[PDB]
Amino acid sequence: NLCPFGEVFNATKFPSVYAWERKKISNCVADYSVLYNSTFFSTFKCYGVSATKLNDLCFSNVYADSFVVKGDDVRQIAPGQTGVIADYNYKLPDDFMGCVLAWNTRNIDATSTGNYNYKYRYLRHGKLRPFERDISNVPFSPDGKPCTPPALNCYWPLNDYGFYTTTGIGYQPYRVVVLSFEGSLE
Amino acid sequence: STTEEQAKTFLQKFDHEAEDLSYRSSLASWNYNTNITDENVQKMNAARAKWSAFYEEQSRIAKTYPLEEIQNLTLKRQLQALQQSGTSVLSADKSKRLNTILNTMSTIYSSGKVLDPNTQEYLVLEPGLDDIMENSEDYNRRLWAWEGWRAEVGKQLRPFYEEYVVLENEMARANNYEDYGDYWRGDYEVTGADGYDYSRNQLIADVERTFAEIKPLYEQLHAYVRAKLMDAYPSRISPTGCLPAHLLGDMWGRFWTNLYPLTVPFGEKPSIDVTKEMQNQSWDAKRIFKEAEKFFVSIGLPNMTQEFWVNSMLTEPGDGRKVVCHPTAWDLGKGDFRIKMCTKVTMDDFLTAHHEMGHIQYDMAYATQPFLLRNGANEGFHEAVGEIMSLSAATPHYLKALGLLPPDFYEDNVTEINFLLKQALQIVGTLPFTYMLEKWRWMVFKGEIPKEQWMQKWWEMKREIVGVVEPLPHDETYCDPACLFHVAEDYSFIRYYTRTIYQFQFHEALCQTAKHEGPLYKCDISNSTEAGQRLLQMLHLGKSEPWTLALENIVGVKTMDVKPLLNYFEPLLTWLKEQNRNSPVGWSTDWTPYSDQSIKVRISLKSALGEKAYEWNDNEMYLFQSSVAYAMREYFSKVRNETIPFGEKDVWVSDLKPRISFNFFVTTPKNVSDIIPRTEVEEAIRMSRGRIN
Ligand SMILES: [Zn+2]
């Protein structure tokens, strides 16, 4: 069958960056023609492979990691990057093999009054491992002793993205689909 | 974790929550300004209240982390900016009485009006009294509006301002300052740096030092304007005295720019105005900003974002929406930069487009700084960046490059001198006014001026620092400084002095990097990317570095310097000296507009010296003022055969030395401009016993 890329990029539900969801793509003929030819995506940064050589290669498993980040946070979805999104929300290994696809969705995910349905983790004890997910909304203390907010030095680790249609492109919502390819060295 | 690590994560929580509340407050403010109604005021104030309440509640939490524990300088700057409390230290009783005083002072100023001699007419400050002060050239009508504003707004604001000083001094001393003026000088306070330290006492030293160098330029400009005002008002202004306060082109004498038609050097030559050449090239409001944008992209600054053009209100809306028609540049946050300007195709709005975009460029530069460090280096830096853009935009070189002037255009020395004189009336004429007014408040907060000498010292420094005489004697019932908007609005006024000095320090430094050969007033930094790169060094810093270091980046020195300002008006100083060869240069504080007809009174102390029974200090002086009116009132009815209700208001007292002497004169009611000659007054005095010979 055809790999349902239209069920990933055109999905009406994109999860938060800290709660990013992964879909397994396999046992389907891989047709990536809609990606590179179309100018829909604002980023097509492939790593460890070439976009033109995707068609030539085959026999791999594809994982599609979908989430929404800020406009300025797409820089941190590159392998070897540092930030509140790379360290605490979504980390890519330095040997990552795949392509990162992001496109502006100010029309969809941004509202005049502010769309706060998307959250990111900015407080954590230690950085995330590559392809590791932390969805625990427990209060954070710099020393590490548990406490109940509101208090001093006790904060919630998740803070909402404030998405408006009037903000600059760096503060506008972007939907990011990270594609992971099973390498020939399986 | 140490206290710096705990303050580091507190700033992360603040920066995220401050960003949304600040953006919501600014977003609500924009909708009100772009659509004035009753619903938008509620949303504007509600959003502003949330941001204010959050900032105040978060400010005390920041003080939980002492600054000395924080080793990192970036975090130390942010907490220091957040740990400032202000009126928080005051008790609930005192912090609520202060808001009552501050709001009542703004209400009195906003609702101030005078009733014309035409009885069925009230004249508000805008546009009623401002039109008389800016446009009218009648001595009698200007003194009516000038004295009327002082007698109405100033007298009501006097009791509130005395309590304002006491309450604000208590707040400042609670925050460990010496006085409320010392609190205001903390905007130029750098303490954590090494070699970049600026004290609060250093500000007054530099302000006073720089003003001593502007005085030779201002005296030559004061002498030229004085001679020209003698042509317009013959016999009403002394050739060697000061300038009457009501003849300075506006209500307060802050700017002399409205005296240009009277003091134009070469009136035959017209000004270099391109407003009618823009109308003939089909220029629009968007065209003006598009050309302003290319100026900043010429010097290497970034162009305006695509969000700027859609979001900004660059013209008055066609539909019937009330908008504020005051040009401003908006940094709402979240990368949202807007300009609200009711743009007209005129040239004056063309220069405003370069000024307002000079703010957006500053805001865009430090937009990557931490949220608490996203502002100008100090209060004078932001308004200096915009002004230097208008200096290059008004240059005939810039106008010819835009096609608004013919390529074969002669810049004659007559037109250039007219330009510098126009600049001096606005830039130089305000410096002594700004210095003197803020010096008065600094000494009033310091307690150096007792509240019984507030008006004695206000007009003593006006006649000595500004060279301006009061047309009428104001005696301790007026608050003349409070009649200005800023004084009654609890706004520091020294920012308008330092901004002028910084303006020509930036302009001279940028023109040097642009390799400009010639006078400084003909400099255009356009198409010089190196000038923009030097400018961006200061712009991107924001509040991250002390303003002394930020000043050093663009200027090369970390001290305020006025020699660049004196270099701008060097061609005008040469021309002013040639004109003032046969005119007096300088003013004498002795002469007053009422001194010639003033009658001195000698008090003979017939009572025993040093007796507690008779305290003849201040309670008995009002009887003579209300008694002399009766003598003149009876005199006019008997002799002049006309009845005039003379009262204590009509008799004016000046140079009052208690128990010794005082000078007085009488004026016709509602006609204070024309004062009765002393001979007629002495004729009434000669009718009774002759006390003074
Ligand atoms: Zn401005």
Author numbering:
A (entry chain B): 321 to 506
B (entry chain A): 19 to 711
Paper text:
SARS-CoV-2 uses the receptor-binding domain (RBD) in the S protein to interact with angiotensin-converting enzyme 2 (ACE2), which is also the receptor of SARS-CoV. We found that ACE2s from sperm whales, minke whales, dolphins, sea lions, fur seals and hippopotami could efficiently bind to the RBD of both SARS-CoV and SARS-CoV-2 and facilitate the transduction of SARS-CoV and SARS-CoV-2 pseudoviruses into ACE2-expressing cells. Then, we chose minke whale ACE2 and sea lion ACE2, which displayed high binding affinities to both RBDs, for further study and determined their cryo-electron microscopy (cryo-EM) structures in complex with either SARS-CoV-2 RBD or SARS-CoV RBD.
We prepared complexes of MW-ACE2/SARS-CoV-2 RBD, MW-ACE2/SARS-CoV RBD, SL-ACE2/SARS-CoV-2 RBD and SL-ACE2/SARS-CoV RBD, and solved their structures at resolutions of 2.87, 2.93, 3.03 and 2.89 Å, respectively. Notably, MW-ACE2 showed even higher binding affinity with SARS-CoV RBD than hACE2. Notably, MW-ACE2 forms significantly more van der Waals (vdw) contacts and comparable H-bonds with SARS-CoV RBD than hACE2, which explains its stronger binding to the SARS-CoV RBD. When bound to the SARS-CoV RBD, R42 (corresponding to Q42 in hACE2), E325 (corresponding to G326 in hACE2) and N329 (corresponding to N330 in hACE2) on MW-ACE2 form additional H-bonds. When bound to the SARS-CoV RBD, MW-ACE2 shows five substitutions, including D30Q, Q42R, L79I, M82T and E329V (328 in MW-ACE2 numbering). On the SARS-CoV RBD, S432, T433, D463, D480, T485 and Q492 interact with MW-ACE2 but not with hACE2, and Y481 exclusively interacts with hACE2. When binding to the SARS-CoV RBD, MW-ACE2 involves another substitution, E329V, which negates a salt bridge between E329 and R426.
